[PDB]
């Protein structure tokens, strides 16, 4: 039907006239934008051999190309339908191929392998012990050809993505500086690919995030927090904000950069995901020493996220919060008040009738630190009362408060009941 | 400490 026996003749004709018309014919069967008839090519048990075979063919390159296009199609469908292509053996022909005298023919090997690595950790890992880099990475080299260097960093991507479990970070920590220099480049997509690679590579404990530190890219990342393209601020966004969620030292590298003057125009972007990620990136800034928060308050943030937090979704309202409940976990006693006289106190208490029963304990500790605050500096008795509750009460606060005692959670029932009678 | 933590295929076409 699908596959006439002509093709499968020509296919497994010695005349390599024959070959390449069978080979062509399943290259344009498999490239048809529903959905191309991958079982069925599959099914025919001595195909995909015979096509990792003509791979070898370094006498002819149109032939390579034809058979190496056929089988990243094949590769760009389930995971079943990869593994036919992983144990015929295809993946150390493509690496081996990478260092080819056809520029079409290397192309389309790493964009198999990109496929390939795009699979799952065990294809990535397989892929990344057939030492795939040493050659990708040389592919940088000639900065002659375009499409060829994004197939590269997205190749190089897919290497680097995966949490559950993540990479052998020694076996890919090698390109991180030709990242490094890849970030000044024109194109976005390969400023898109480049940022997502950093991003993966950043997502792990400190060290890490100190190595693509060592590696010199955050004034990059940051700067290019203002691209017009999002394809490139979402993943810059998103590797800023794995590198701020180390210790003061490294996050202070971030701050160096002047990052917290474009994060406060990414907090007014169209896009709620960048909004959001912004709003945790602060947040994780905010958790840290009080130069830190005070730098955030310095570039006049605290009022883009108590706007934020009144009118923007609830998924982004939950990492707001816990910015400034960060700010006054962790703040000098001017600069929580510097927080209470923007009115951070009304958002806070309307968290509490949300269903999200963590963030109702964010706003409870929030609300507790500026209690706290408040009757220490009632301990210094000039006035007996605490000021801020009588604030907290102008906001029908602890009207919610007492309300929170007929919660379900024992948490928050029981630290409402502290609260009300510590300072009620 | 108080820091929270974050929370592929191309198919190739002439046409």
Known sequence: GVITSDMIEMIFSKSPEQQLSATQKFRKLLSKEPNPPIDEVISTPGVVARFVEFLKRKENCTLQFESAWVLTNIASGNSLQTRIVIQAGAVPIFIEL?????????????????????????????????????????????????????????????????????????????????????????????????????????????????????????????????????????????????????????????????ALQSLLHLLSSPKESIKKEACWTISNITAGNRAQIQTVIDANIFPALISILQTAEFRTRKEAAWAITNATSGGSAEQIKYLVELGCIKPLCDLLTVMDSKIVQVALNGLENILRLGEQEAKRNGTGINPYCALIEEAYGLDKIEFLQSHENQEIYQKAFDLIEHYF | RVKRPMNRRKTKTLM
């Open chain 1, 98 to 258: 990478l260092s080819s005298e056809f520029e079409d023919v290397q192309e389309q090997a790493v964009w198999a392998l990109g496929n390939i690595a795009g699979d799952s950790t065990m294809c990535r890992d397989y892929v990344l012990d057939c030492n795939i880099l040493p050659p990708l990475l040389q592919l940088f080299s000639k900065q002659n050809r375009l499409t060829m260097t994004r197939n590269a960093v997205w190749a190089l991507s897919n290497l680097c993505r995966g949490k559950s479990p993540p990479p052998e970070f020694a076996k890919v920590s090698p390109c991180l500086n030709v990242l490094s220099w890849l970030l000044f480049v024109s194109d976005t997509d390969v400023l898109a690919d480049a940022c997502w690679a950093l991003s993966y590579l950043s997502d792990g404990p400190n060290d890490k995030i100190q190595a693509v530190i060592d590696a010199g890219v955050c004034r990059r990342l940051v700067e290019l927090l203002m691209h017009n393209d999002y394809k490139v601020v979402s993943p810059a966004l998103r590797a800023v904000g794995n590198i701020v969620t180390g210790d003061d030292i490294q996050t202070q590298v971030i701050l160096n950069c002047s």
